[PDB]
Every structure is written in structure tokens, then in C-alpha cells.
PDB file of C-alpha atoms in Angstrom:
ATOM      1  CA  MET J   1       5.217 -12.962  -2.327  1.00 37.00           C
ATOM      2  CA  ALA J   2       8.434 -12.093  -0.597  1.00 36.80           C
ATOM      3  CA  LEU J   3      11.383 -14.364  -1.261  1.00 34.84           C
ATOM      4  CA  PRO J   4      13.234 -14.475   2.053  1.00 35.67           C
ATOM      5  CA  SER J   5      12.368 -17.415   4.304  1.00 36.79           C
ATOM      6  CA  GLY J   6      13.576 -19.166   7.450  1.00 38.94           C
ATOM      7  CA  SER J   7      14.937 -17.463  10.560  1.00 41.33           C
ATOM      8  CA  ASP J   8      14.917 -13.692  11.032  1.00 41.12           C
ATOM      9  CA  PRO J   9      18.261 -11.986  10.411  1.00 39.57           C
ATOM     10  CA  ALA J  10      20.088 -10.933  13.576  1.00 39.41           C
ATOM     11  CA  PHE J  11      19.681  -7.416  14.961  1.00 37.02           C
ATOM     12  CA  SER J  12      22.742  -5.142  14.951  1.00 35.62           C
ATOM     13  CA  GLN J  13      21.346  -3.231  17.943  1.00 36.26           C
ATOM     14  CA  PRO J  14      20.839  -4.629  21.464  1.00 37.47           C
ATOM     15  CA  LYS J  15      17.263  -5.442  22.468  1.00 36.30           C
ATOM     16  CA  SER J  16      17.313  -2.875  25.298  1.00 35.96           C
ATOM     17  CA  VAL J  17      18.232  -0.151  22.785  1.00 34.57           C
ATOM     18  CA  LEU J  18      15.413  -1.219  20.447  1.00 33.95           C
ATOM     19  CA  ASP J  19      12.914  -1.391  23.328  1.00 34.81           C
ATOM     20  CA  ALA J  20      14.016   2.119  24.364  1.00 30.31           C
ATOM     21  CA  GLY J  21      12.931   3.397  20.939  1.00 30.66           C
ATOM     22  CA  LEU J  22       9.330   2.206  21.443  1.00 32.03           C
ATOM     23  CA  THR J  23       6.648   4.115  23.378  1.00 31.49           C
ATOM     24  CA  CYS J  24       2.881   3.645  23.778  1.00 30.48           C
ATOM     25  CA  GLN J  25       0.431   6.325  24.877  1.00 31.86           C
ATOM     26  CA  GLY J  26      -0.573   5.582  28.491  1.00 32.14           C
ATOM     27  CA  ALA J  27       0.529   1.949  28.280  1.00 31.07           C
ATOM     28  CA  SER J  28       3.488  -0.406  28.215  1.00 32.18           C
ATOM     29  CA  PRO J  29       4.074  -2.459  25.045  1.00 31.77           C
ATOM     30  CA  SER J  30       4.082  -5.442  27.476  1.00 29.65           C
ATOM     31  CA  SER J  31       0.420  -4.885  28.276  1.00 30.81           C
ATOM     32  CA  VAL J  32      -1.598  -3.016  25.746  1.00 31.87           C
ATOM     33  CA  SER J  33      -5.146  -3.081  24.347  1.00 28.41           C
ATOM     34  CA  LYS J  34      -5.591  -2.651  20.590  1.00 24.62           C
ATOM     35  CA  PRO J  35      -2.139  -1.228  19.774  1.00 22.45           C
ATOM     36  CA  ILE J  36      -1.407   0.519  16.481  1.00 24.36           C
ATOM     37  CA  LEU J  37       2.249   0.940  15.512  1.00 25.01           C
ATOM     38  CA  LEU J  38       3.151   4.282  13.974  1.00 24.72           C
ATOM     39  CA  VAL J  39       6.374   4.515  11.922  1.00 25.40           C
ATOM     40  CA  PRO J  40       7.666   8.078  11.301  1.00 25.52           C
ATOM     41  CA  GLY J  41       9.113   9.895   8.294  1.00 25.01           C
ATOM     42  CA  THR J  42      12.669  10.958   7.458  1.00 25.47           C
ATOM     43  CA  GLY J  43      13.931  13.735   9.736  1.00 27.24           C
ATOM     44  CA  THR J  44      11.390  13.120  12.524  1.00 30.58           C
ATOM     45  CA  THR J  45      10.713  11.235  15.728  1.00 31.10           C
ATOM     46  CA  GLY J  46       7.414   9.380  16.260  1.00 29.67           C
ATOM     47  CA  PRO J  47       5.896  12.299  18.194  1.00 31.79           C
ATOM     48  CA  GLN J  48       7.078  14.792  15.555  1.00 29.31           C
ATOM     49  CA  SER J  49       5.428  12.782  12.774  1.00 27.50           C
ATOM     50  CA  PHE J  50       2.196  11.928  14.602  1.00 26.76           C
ATOM     51  CA  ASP J  51       1.439  14.167  17.648  1.00 27.51           C
ATOM     52  CA  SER J  52      -0.527  16.516  15.412  1.00 29.54           C
ATOM     53  CA  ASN J  53      -2.407  13.780  13.551  1.00 30.11           C
ATOM     54  CA  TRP J  54      -2.516   9.985  13.939  1.00 33.37           C
ATOM     55  CA  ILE J  55      -1.760   9.809  17.650  1.00 34.68           C
ATOM     56  CA  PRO J  56      -5.006  11.607  18.622  1.00 31.36           C
ATOM     57  CA  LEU J  57      -6.930  10.300  15.581  1.00 30.84           C
ATOM     58  CA  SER J  58      -6.128   6.622  16.240  1.00 33.81           C
ATOM     59  CA  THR J  59      -6.928   7.156  19.937  1.00 32.97           C
ATOM     60  CA  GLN J  60     -10.382   8.459  18.984  1.00 32.58           C
ATOM     61  CA  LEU J  61     -10.861   5.323  16.859  1.00 35.43           C
ATOM     62  CA  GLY J  62     -10.221   3.166  19.949  1.00 35.91           C
ATOM     63  CA  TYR J  63      -6.571   2.205  19.468  1.00 36.08           C
ATOM     64  CA  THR J  64      -3.632   2.715  21.786  1.00 36.65           C
ATOM     65  CA  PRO J  65      -1.102   4.513  19.573  1.00 34.49           C
ATOM     66  CA  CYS J  66       2.495   3.327  19.863  1.00 31.79           C
ATOM     67  CA  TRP J  67       5.491   4.643  17.920  1.00 34.78           C
ATOM     68  CA  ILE J  68       9.160   4.152  17.323  1.00 35.82           C
ATOM     69  CA  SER J  69      11.778   6.897  17.211  1.00 36.58           C
ATOM     70  CA  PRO J  70      14.969   5.473  15.645  1.00 38.40           C
ATOM     71  CA  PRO J  71      17.852   7.934  16.204  1.00 39.04           C
ATOM     72  CA  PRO J  72      18.823  10.389  14.854  1.00 39.52           C
ATOM     73  CA  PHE J  73      15.404  11.407  13.474  1.00 40.95           C
ATOM     74  CA  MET J  74      15.183   8.450  11.021  1.00 39.42           C
ATOM     75  CA  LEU J  75      18.353   9.699   9.263  1.00 39.12           C
ATOM     76  CA  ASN J  76      20.487   6.612   9.900  1.00 38.17           C
ATOM     77  CA  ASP J  77      20.506   3.426   7.883  1.00 35.10           C
ATOM     78  CA  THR J  78      17.009   2.369   7.001  1.00 38.96           C
ATOM     79  CA  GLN J  79      18.032  -1.178   7.844  1.00 33.60           C
ATOM     80  CA  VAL J  80      18.687  -0.154  11.435  1.00 33.35           C
ATOM     81  CA  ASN J  81      15.470   1.882  11.554  1.00 35.18           C
ATOM     82  CA  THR J  82      13.696  -1.348  10.585  1.00 34.82           C
ATOM     83  CA  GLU J  83      15.126  -3.205  13.618  1.00 34.29           C
ATOM     84  CA  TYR J  84      13.109  -0.843  15.820  1.00 31.55           C
ATOM     85  CA  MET J  85       9.946  -1.661  13.897  1.00 29.59           C
ATOM     86  CA  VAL J  86      10.463  -5.447  13.845  1.00 30.56           C
ATOM     87  CA  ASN J  87      11.202  -5.544  17.583  1.00 30.50           C
ATOM     88  CA  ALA J  88       8.163  -3.329  18.208  1.00 30.74           C
ATOM     89  CA  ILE J  89       5.843  -5.693  16.307  1.00 32.51           C
ATOM     90  CA  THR J  90       7.224  -8.675  18.242  1.00 32.87           C
ATOM     91  CA  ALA J  91       6.642  -6.765  21.504  1.00 32.07           C
ATOM     92  CA  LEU J  92       3.178  -5.416  20.670  1.00 31.53           C
ATOM     93  CA  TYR J  93       1.879  -8.722  19.291  1.00 33.80           C
ATOM     94  CA  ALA J  94       2.845 -10.498  22.524  1.00 31.13           C
ATOM     95  CA  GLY J  95       1.836  -7.553  24.736  1.00 32.27           C
ATOM     96  CA  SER J  96      -1.680  -7.513  23.281  1.00 33.61           C
ATOM     97  CA  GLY J  97      -2.132 -11.255  23.919  1.00 34.28           C
ATOM     98  CA  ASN J  98      -0.830 -12.616  20.601  1.00 32.06           C
ATOM     99  CA  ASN J  99      -3.182 -10.480  18.536  1.00 33.41           C
ATOM    100  CA  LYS J 100      -2.268  -9.045  15.141  1.00 30.47           C
ATOM    101  CA  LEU J 101      -1.905  -5.258  15.026  1.00 30.29           C
ATOM    102  CA  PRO J 102      -2.134  -2.578  12.333  1.00 29.61           C
ATOM    103  CA  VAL J 103       0.875  -0.547  11.218  1.00 30.03           C
ATOM    104  CA  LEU J 104       0.421   3.050  10.043  1.00 29.90           C
ATOM    105  CA  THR J 105       3.250   5.012   8.448  1.00 33.56           C
ATOM    106  CA  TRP J 106       4.426   8.225   6.819  1.00 31.26           C
ATOM    107  CA  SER J 107       7.039   8.576   4.111  1.00 33.04           C
ATOM    108  CA  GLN J 108      10.132   6.417   4.889  1.00 30.70           C
ATOM    109  CA  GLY J 109       8.066   4.650   7.556  1.00 28.69           C
ATOM    110  CA  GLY J 110       6.239   2.747   4.806  1.00 25.09           C
ATOM    111  CA  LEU J 111       9.506   1.674   3.216  1.00 23.22           C
ATOM    112  CA  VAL J 112      10.668   0.550   6.676  1.00 20.52           C
ATOM    113  CA  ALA J 113       7.461  -1.436   7.214  1.00 20.88           C
ATOM    114  CA  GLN J 114       7.730  -3.150   3.838  1.00 19.79           C
ATOM    115  CA  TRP J 115      11.456  -3.814   4.386  1.00 18.00           C
ATOM    116  CA  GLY J 116      10.644  -5.450   7.712  1.00 19.85           C
ATOM    117  CA  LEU J 117       7.895  -7.584   6.177  1.00 20.21           C
ATOM    118  CA  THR J 118      10.180  -8.605   3.299  1.00 21.69           C
ATOM    119  CA  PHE J 119      13.253  -9.628   5.292  1.00 21.12           C
ATOM    120  CA  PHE J 120      11.938 -10.641   8.731  1.00 23.75           C
ATOM    121  CA  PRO J 121       9.473 -13.518   8.143  1.00 21.79           C
ATOM    122  CA  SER J 122       8.378 -13.749  11.804  1.00 18.68           C
ATOM    123  CA  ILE J 123       6.369 -10.506  11.686  1.00 18.55           C
ATOM    124  CA  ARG J 124       4.352 -11.442   8.580  1.00 16.38           C
ATOM    125  CA  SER J 125       1.832 -13.283  10.779  1.00 14.48           C
ATOM    126  CA  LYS J 126       1.806 -10.505  13.396  1.00 12.69           C
ATOM    127  CA  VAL J 127       0.912  -7.472  11.272  1.00 13.77           C
ATOM    128  CA  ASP J 128      -2.814  -7.286  10.565  1.00 13.73           C
ATOM    129  CA  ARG J 129      -2.621  -4.610   7.869  1.00 14.89           C
ATOM    130  CA  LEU J 130      -0.488  -1.714   6.648  1.00 13.11           C
ATOM    131  CA  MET J 131      -1.808   1.818   6.092  1.00 16.08           C
ATOM    132  CA  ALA J 132       0.993   3.766   4.416  1.00 18.28           C
ATOM    133  CA  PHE J 133       0.815   7.501   3.716  1.00 19.57           C
ATOM    134  CA  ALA J 134       3.134   8.750   0.950  1.00 20.04           C
ATOM    135  CA  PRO J 135       5.409   5.721   1.031  1.00 20.83           C
ATOM    136  CA  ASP J 136       8.490   5.594  -1.120  1.00 22.28           C
ATOM    137  CA  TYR J 137       8.981   1.968  -2.051  1.00 18.68           C
ATOM    138  CA  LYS J 138      10.823   2.949  -5.259  1.00 17.76           C
ATOM    139  CA  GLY J 139      12.525   5.859  -3.499  1.00 16.11           C
ATOM    140  CA  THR J 140      12.397   9.311  -5.064  1.00 18.81           C
ATOM    141  CA  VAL J 141      14.015  10.993  -8.077  1.00 18.81           C
ATOM    142  CA  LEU J 142      13.877  14.400  -6.368  1.00 13.93           C
ATOM    143  CA  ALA J 150      27.736  16.360  -2.077  1.00 12.82           C
ATOM    144  CA  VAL J 151      26.955  14.458   1.139  1.00 15.44           C
ATOM    145  CA  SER J 152      23.484  13.277   2.264  1.00 14.25           C
ATOM    146  CA  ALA J 153      21.938  11.367   5.137  1.00 11.01           C
ATOM    147  CA  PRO J 154      22.336   7.558   5.153  1.00 11.52           C
ATOM    148  CA  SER J 155      18.573   7.033   4.727  1.00 13.57           C
ATOM    149  CA  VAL J 156      18.354   9.752   2.050  1.00 12.75           C
ATOM    150  CA  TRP J 157      20.830   7.743  -0.067  1.00 13.57           C
ATOM    151  CA  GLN J 158      18.727   4.662   0.485  1.00 14.89           C
ATOM    152  CA  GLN J 159      15.549   6.486  -0.552  1.00 15.47           C
ATOM    153  CA  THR J 160      17.088   7.753  -3.797  1.00 15.09           C
ATOM    154  CA  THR J 161      15.667   6.003  -6.864  1.00 16.69           C
ATOM    155  CA  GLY J 162      18.208   3.467  -8.117  1.00 17.35           C
ATOM    156  CA  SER J 163      19.596   2.869  -4.603  1.00 18.77           C
ATOM    157  CA  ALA J 164      20.956  -0.514  -3.539  1.00 16.88           C
ATOM    158  CA  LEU J 165      18.268  -0.604  -0.830  1.00 16.59           C
ATOM    159  CA  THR J 166      15.317  -0.058  -3.184  1.00 16.48           C
ATOM    160  CA  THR J 167      16.935  -2.527  -5.610  1.00 17.14           C
ATOM    161  CA  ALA J 168      17.100  -5.194  -2.891  1.00 19.74           C
ATOM    162  CA  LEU J 169      13.506  -4.579  -1.761  1.00 18.69           C
ATOM    163  CA  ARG J 170      12.252  -5.009  -5.329  1.00 17.82           C
ATOM    164  CA  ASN J 171      14.330  -8.089  -6.118  1.00 17.62           C
ATOM    165  CA  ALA J 172      13.293  -9.820  -2.886  1.00 18.76           C
ATOM    166  CA  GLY J 173       9.629  -9.385  -3.909  1.00 19.00           C
ATOM    167  CA  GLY J 174       8.901  -6.303  -1.789  1.00 18.30           C
ATOM    168  CA  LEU J 175       7.021  -4.302  -4.437  1.00 20.36           C
ATOM    169  CA  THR J 176       4.094  -6.687  -3.998  1.00 19.27           C
ATOM    170  CA  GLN J 177       2.055  -6.364  -0.786  1.00 18.97           C
ATOM    171  CA  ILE J 178       2.885  -8.850   1.976  1.00 17.61           C
ATOM    172  CA  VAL J 179      -0.015  -8.062   4.319  1.00 22.30           C
ATOM    173  CA  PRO J 180      -3.247  -6.296   3.286  1.00 20.85           C
ATOM    174  CA  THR J 181      -1.977  -2.808   2.437  1.00 20.82           C
ATOM    175  CA  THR J 182      -3.451   0.582   1.600  1.00 21.00           C
ATOM    176  CA  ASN J 183      -1.182   3.243   0.090  1.00 23.17           C
ATOM    177  CA  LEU J 184      -2.475   6.820   0.087  1.00 24.93           C
ATOM    178  CA  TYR J 185      -0.466   9.300  -1.959  1.00 27.54           C
ATOM    179  CA  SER J 186      -0.575  12.421  -4.113  1.00 28.99           C
ATOM    180  CA  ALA J 187       0.467  13.195  -7.686  1.00 32.83           C
ATOM    181  CA  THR J 188       1.589  16.609  -6.409  1.00 30.22           C
ATOM    182  CA  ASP J 189       3.974  15.188  -3.783  1.00 29.71           C
ATOM    183  CA  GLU J 190       6.961  17.567  -3.723  1.00 26.91           C
ATOM    184  CA  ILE J 191       9.258  15.070  -1.924  1.00 22.79           C
ATOM    185  CA  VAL J 192       8.441  11.699  -3.514  1.00 23.85           C
ATOM    186  CA  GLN J 193       8.273  11.369  -7.316  1.00 26.42           C
ATOM    187  CA  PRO J 194       7.226   9.859  -9.669  1.00 26.33           C
ATOM    188  CA  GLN J 195       3.656   9.719  -8.322  1.00 27.09           C
ATOM    189  CA  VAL J 196       1.667  11.136 -11.246  1.00 27.92           C
ATOM    190  CA  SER J 197       0.560   8.099 -13.268  1.00 25.27           C
ATOM    191  CA  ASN J 198      -1.996   6.405 -10.950  1.00 26.92           C
ATOM    192  CA  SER J 199      -0.253   3.146 -11.904  1.00 29.77           C
ATOM    193  CA  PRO J 200       2.647   0.751 -11.009  1.00 28.78           C
ATOM    194  CA  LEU J 201       5.071   3.508 -12.089  1.00 28.31           C
ATOM    195  CA  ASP J 202       4.274   5.395  -8.867  1.00 27.53           C
ATOM    196  CA  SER J 203       6.702   5.101  -5.966  1.00 24.48           C
ATOM    197  CA  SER J 204       3.843   4.498  -3.487  1.00 22.47           C
ATOM    198  CA  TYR J 205       2.362   1.626  -5.532  1.00 25.43           C
ATOM    199  CA  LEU J 206       2.332  -2.004  -4.358  1.00 20.26           C
ATOM    200  CA  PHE J 207       1.095  -4.827  -6.506  1.00 21.15           C
ATOM    201  CA  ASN J 208      -2.103  -6.229  -5.105  1.00 19.77           C
ATOM    202  CA  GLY J 209      -2.307  -3.298  -2.771  1.00 17.89           C
ATOM    203  CA  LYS J 210      -5.116  -0.800  -2.418  1.00 15.51           C
ATOM    204  CA  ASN J 211      -3.326   2.070  -4.136  1.00 13.31           C
ATOM    205  CA  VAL J 212      -5.177   5.337  -3.635  1.00 13.09           C
ATOM    206  CA  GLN J 213      -3.791   8.317  -5.509  1.00 14.37           C
ATOM    207  CA  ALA J 214      -5.765  11.291  -4.145  1.00 13.23           C
ATOM    208  CA  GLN J 215      -6.285  12.762  -7.639  1.00 14.93           C
ATOM    209  CA  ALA J 216      -7.895   9.516  -8.856  1.00 16.50           C
ATOM    210  CA  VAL J 217     -10.714  10.103  -6.335  1.00 17.88           C
ATOM    211  CA  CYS J 218     -10.734  13.888  -5.986  1.00 16.67           C
ATOM    212  CA  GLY J 219      -9.837  14.965  -9.511  1.00 12.30           C
ATOM    213  CA  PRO J 220      -6.629  15.825 -11.400  1.00 18.08           C
ATOM    214  CA  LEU J 221      -6.415  19.299  -9.899  1.00 17.62           C
ATOM    215  CA  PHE J 222      -6.776  18.301  -6.231  1.00 19.00           C
ATOM    216  CA  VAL J 223      -3.638  19.336  -4.336  1.00 20.57           C
ATOM    217  CA  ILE J 224      -2.136  17.874  -1.164  1.00 17.43           C
ATOM    218  CA  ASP J 225       1.613  17.756  -0.525  1.00 22.90           C
ATOM    219  CA  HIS J 226       3.871  15.189   1.152  1.00 22.39           C
ATOM    220  CA  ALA J 227       2.735  16.198   4.638  1.00 25.12           C
ATOM    221  CA  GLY J 228      -0.903  16.696   3.573  1.00 26.36           C
ATOM    222  CA  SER J 229      -0.850  13.097   2.362  1.00 27.31           C
ATOM    223  CA  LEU J 230      -0.643  12.168   6.064  1.00 24.03           C
ATOM    224  CA  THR J 231      -2.662  14.942   7.696  1.00 20.35           C
ATOM    225  CA  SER J 232      -5.616  15.846   5.450  1.00 23.75           C
ATOM    226  CA  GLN J 233      -9.275  15.077   6.157  1.00 25.24           C
ATOM    227  CA  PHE J 234      -9.319  13.052   2.941  1.00 28.08           C
ATOM    228  CA  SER J 235      -6.344  11.052   4.232  1.00 28.17           C
ATOM    229  CA  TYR J 236      -8.196  10.517   7.519  1.00 28.92           C
ATOM    230  CA  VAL J 237     -11.286   9.120   5.757  1.00 26.69           C
ATOM    231  CA  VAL J 238      -9.174   6.665   3.720  1.00 25.40           C
ATOM    232  CA  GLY J 239      -7.126   5.685   6.798  1.00 27.19           C
ATOM    233  CA  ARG J 240     -10.271   5.127   8.881  1.00 25.10           C
ATOM    234  CA  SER J 241     -11.635   2.875   6.107  1.00 27.01           C
ATOM    235  CA  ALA J 242      -8.425   0.836   5.926  1.00 32.13           C
ATOM    236  CA  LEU J 243      -8.329   0.392   9.710  1.00 30.65           C
ATOM    237  CA  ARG J 244     -11.973  -0.664  10.019  1.00 33.07           C
ATOM    238  CA  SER J 245     -12.202  -2.832   6.873  1.00 31.64           C
ATOM    239  CA  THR J 246     -12.808  -6.586   7.090  1.00 33.16           C
ATOM    240  CA  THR J 247     -10.512  -7.026   4.053  1.00 34.48           C
ATOM    241  CA  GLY J 248      -7.628  -5.158   5.721  1.00 37.31           C
ATOM    242  CA  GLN J 249      -7.681  -2.591   2.891  1.00 36.64           C
ATOM    243  CA  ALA J 250      -9.573   0.681   2.449  1.00 39.25           C
ATOM    244  CA  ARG J 251     -12.825   0.239   0.493  1.00 38.59           C
ATOM    245  CA  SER J 252     -13.867   2.555  -2.372  1.00 37.67           C
ATOM    246  CA  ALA J 253     -17.462   2.634  -1.072  1.00 35.88           C
ATOM    247  CA  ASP J 254     -16.239   4.249   2.185  1.00 34.76           C
ATOM    248  CA  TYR J 255     -15.000   7.482   0.566  1.00 36.30           C
ATOM    249  CA  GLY J 256     -15.792   9.805  -2.333  1.00 32.95           C
ATOM    250  CA  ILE J 257     -15.749  13.320  -3.788  1.00 34.51           C
ATOM    251  CA  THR J 258     -17.442  14.826  -0.690  1.00 35.90           C
ATOM    252  CA  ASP J 259     -14.485  13.672   1.459  1.00 36.31           C
ATOM    253  CA  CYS J 260     -12.005  15.636  -0.648  1.00 34.44           C
ATOM    254  CA  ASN J 261     -10.993  18.113   2.039  1.00 31.53           C
ATOM    255  CA  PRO J 262      -7.267  18.981   1.747  1.00 30.70           C
ATOM    256  CA  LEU J 263      -7.076  20.749   5.131  1.00 31.08           C
ATOM    257  CA  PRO J 264      -5.920  18.958   8.322  1.00 33.22           C
ATOM    258  CA  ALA J 265      -8.395  16.342   9.634  1.00 30.26           C
ATOM    259  CA  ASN J 266     -11.594  17.899  11.043  1.00 32.14           C
ATOM    260  CA  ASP J 267     -11.349  16.215  14.459  1.00 30.40           C
ATOM    261  CA  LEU J 268      -7.932  17.706  15.250  1.00 31.73           C
ATOM    262  CA  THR J 269      -7.831  20.615  17.710  1.00 29.28           C
ATOM    263  CA  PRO J 270      -6.902  24.045  16.283  1.00 31.54           C
ATOM    264  CA  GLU J 271      -3.430  23.639  17.842  1.00 28.29           C
ATOM    265  CA  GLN J 272      -3.016  20.189  16.249  1.00 29.55           C
ATOM    266  CA  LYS J 273      -4.189  21.559  12.886  1.00 29.55           C
ATOM    267  CA  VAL J 274      -1.537  24.311  12.961  1.00 30.34           C
ATOM    268  CA  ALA J 275       1.166  21.774  13.912  1.00 26.47           C
ATOM    269  CA  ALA J 276      -0.032  19.337  11.212  1.00 24.33           C
ATOM    270  CA  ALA J 277       0.214  22.052   8.545  1.00 22.34           C
ATOM    271  CA  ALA J 278       3.806  22.743   9.647  1.00 22.78           C
ATOM    272  CA  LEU J 279       4.797  19.068   9.755  1.00 25.37           C
ATOM    273  CA  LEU J 280       7.614  19.242   7.193  1.00 24.26           C
ATOM    274  CA  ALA J 281       9.620  22.124   8.716  1.00 24.66           C
ATOM    275  CA  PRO J 282      11.204  20.251  11.665  1.00 25.94           C
ATOM    276  CA  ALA J 283      12.076  17.388   9.287  1.00 27.85           C
ATOM    277  CA  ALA J 284      13.981  19.685   6.914  1.00 26.88           C
ATOM    278  CA  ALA J 285      15.837  21.190   9.902  1.00 26.60           C
ATOM    279  CA  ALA J 286      16.873  17.747  11.197  1.00 27.87           C
ATOM    280  CA  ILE J 287      18.113  16.731   7.730  1.00 30.96           C
ATOM    281  CA  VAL J 288      20.197  19.940   7.464  1.00 29.51           C
ATOM    282  CA  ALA J 289      21.864  19.345  10.844  1.00 30.46           C
ATOM    283  CA  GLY J 290      22.128  15.534  10.723  1.00 28.89           C
ATOM    284  CA  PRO J 291      24.638  12.877   9.606  1.00 27.77           C
ATOM    285  CA  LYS J 292      25.727  13.081   5.957  1.00 29.91           C
ATOM    286  CA  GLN J 293      27.967  10.944   3.753  1.00 30.59           C
ATOM    287  CA  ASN J 294      29.024  10.588   0.098  1.00 31.23           C
ATOM    288  CA  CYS J 295      27.940   6.962  -0.390  1.00 30.51           C
ATOM    289  CA  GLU J 296      24.996   4.658   0.253  1.00 30.70           C
ATOM    290  CA  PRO J 297      25.264   2.580   3.453  1.00 33.68           C
ATOM    291  CA  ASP J 298      26.267  -1.044   2.889  1.00 32.55           C
ATOM    292  CA  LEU J 299      23.472  -3.575   2.676  1.00 32.15           C
ATOM    293  CA  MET J 300      23.269  -6.017   5.551  1.00 31.63           C
ATOM    294  CA  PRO J 301      24.120  -9.640   4.630  1.00 34.26           C
ATOM    295  CA  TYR J 302      20.447 -10.681   4.394  1.00 35.83           C
ATOM    296  CA  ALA J 303      19.765  -8.093   1.677  1.00 35.24           C
ATOM    297  CA  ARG J 304      22.952  -8.264  -0.391  1.00 35.52           C
ATOM    298  CA  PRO J 305      21.944 -11.258  -2.568  1.00 33.36           C
ATOM    299  CA  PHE J 306      19.177  -9.074  -3.972  1.00 35.84           C
ATOM    300  CA  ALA J 307      21.346  -6.172  -5.163  1.00 37.33           C
ATOM    301  CA  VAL J 308      24.447  -7.750  -6.601  1.00 36.35           C
ATOM    302  CA  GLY J 309      26.170  -5.231  -8.863  1.00 40.59           C
ATOM    303  CA  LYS J 310      25.071  -2.132  -6.938  1.00 41.42           C
ATOM    304  CA  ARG J 311      27.648   0.169  -5.330  1.00 42.04           C
ATOM    305  CA  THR J 312      27.600   1.062  -1.636  1.00 43.00           C
ATOM    306  CA  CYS J 313      30.248   2.617   0.653  1.00 43.44           C
ATOM    307  CA  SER J 314      32.448  -0.518   0.773  1.00 45.13           C
ATOM    308  CA  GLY J 315      32.241  -0.989  -3.001  1.00 45.72           C
ATOM    309  CA  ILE J 316      30.322  -3.039  -5.473  1.00 42.73           C
ATOM    310  CA  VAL J 317      28.091  -5.742  -4.070  1.00 41.92           C
ATOM    311  CA  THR J 318      29.325  -9.218  -5.063  1.00 43.47           C
ATOM    312  CA  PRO J 319      27.589 -12.552  -4.848  1.00 42.61           C
ATOM    313  CA  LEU J 320      27.349 -13.908  -1.271  1.00 40.82           C
ATOM    314  CA  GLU J 321      28.342 -17.453  -0.456  1.00 43.06           C
TER     315      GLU J 321
END
């Protein structure tokens, strides 16, 4: 149960700017059948995260894939990245005739989704389910860095605020698929609430818990693998809004890119991380964590951000 209530916080960005960050495949968000919102990882645009995987895969499952691309490559303040997602849900809910829609994410995208659900009450009734691949709700433990990299560092003011506002418990029916061998997000090894991808009451699927302790998929493989596809398909189709254990097993433990992808898509899916690392190298960097927006500050009093130590808010 998330703590924030009442009106949504204001957006810092103009609506036209937020709208500009949203695209659907062969459709307008104003008029779309069975949309799915895809939220990308750090260092990528929507197409860079999903062209080689969930865009074609969700299409083949009968959805219209839509995505956001917060600039620059999800490297700015995670709070701003979230504005794009919240606006997108508002748009896609209305544009599909006031019908709930699923949200599917990679990496930071899951944190963004959960942040949005925690602090923007209006979208809680508009998101049908969340399917998060390698999310980093507790950040990661792995001299200037990107704004959103600060925020995704374990111990950050942002992850502190998410936790203290109730965001480590699922808000909509949620499936989290992740890997103990994740080379970007740790800790992920315990198959328990210690894991960064874990949400209380969520369907938390550590790949090694199903496939065995020596099964290996990395941060990108968590999104792209055939195993990941089978879990994702289950979560999307399920009447409970969560993946079901009966829908997948040891025979689905294929670590290679999803079977239904074209050879070209498979190659691109395998190389998913490279453009992200390049964007991070070349992107904005600073020596402090971005300030929390007013709505989040009450939940991280005592933490230090760029402007200083967060104090109680009247």
C-alpha cells in the first residue's frame, strides 16, 4: 500500500513535451487498440530497448506497443523520466476507451513505473499490471555520474523515498523477472526480499529458482531471453495479472534471445547493452544526486542531494 494520496503532483515538463516523448506502433495514443506501454532502461530510448524484443513480441501477442523515450537516453532525473510515463498512461487509458493497460519495463523502467504508481495516485486505476524485467527498486551496489545513475545507486535519496512511501510493495499486480547473475543490478542472488528486483506481494521470478543455480542470463538477457518471453507471456495473459508458475518450467529455460525474433532481431537483442554503455559514457554527469521533488522529500528526510540535506517539509 503506497502512502501518497490526493491530487497528482504537478509536472515540471509541459504536456506537449511529454506527449512528444510517446510513440505507438502504427497508431496514435489518442486512438489505440490494446496498447502496452514499454518503459526503457538507462542509456536507451524506447526503440533501443525494445526494437529487438518486446516491440515485435507484444505485437505478435495482439498488443499495439507504445513506448516513451525521455531525453537524454533515460540519463536525466528519474523523477522527470516518470512524468513521461504518467502522462503516457493517462493518454493511453483514455485513447483505448478508458481501458486499463499493461506496462512492461527493463531496468530503470521498472523503477520509473513503480515511482509513478507510488506518487501519482491517478494512474493506479489505469495500469492493469506491471511486467518488469531486471528492475532495480533498491538500486544497485555495483567522480561524476549521470543523474539517474546516482538515483539508482543503493542508499540513494530516490530509493529511500520509494521505500518509505510504501513502494517496495506491489501497487498493481506485478511480475518481476530477474537473474542472480545480473552484472548491472546487485544484490539479486538470494531469491528473497533482499533482491533489488523484489516487491512484496509481487510475483518475483528469479531465473535460477526455476532453471537451476547455474543458469546464466545477464542484465540484457533478463529482458530478451526465450525464458523471459515465456514468463512475460504468462504475466500478460494471466487472469490474476501476474505470471503463473504452471505456465513455465525447466523446458522453457532457454537463455538465447526469444525464438520468435528474426535473426536480425536476435543479433540486436544480444548486443542490447552496448549502445546503453556508450550513451552513459557521453551523457550528462554530476557529483551529487538530483534533488527530490517536493512530493517525495517527506520520505527521505536526512538524505543528501545536490542542494544539501533533506529537511522536513511544511
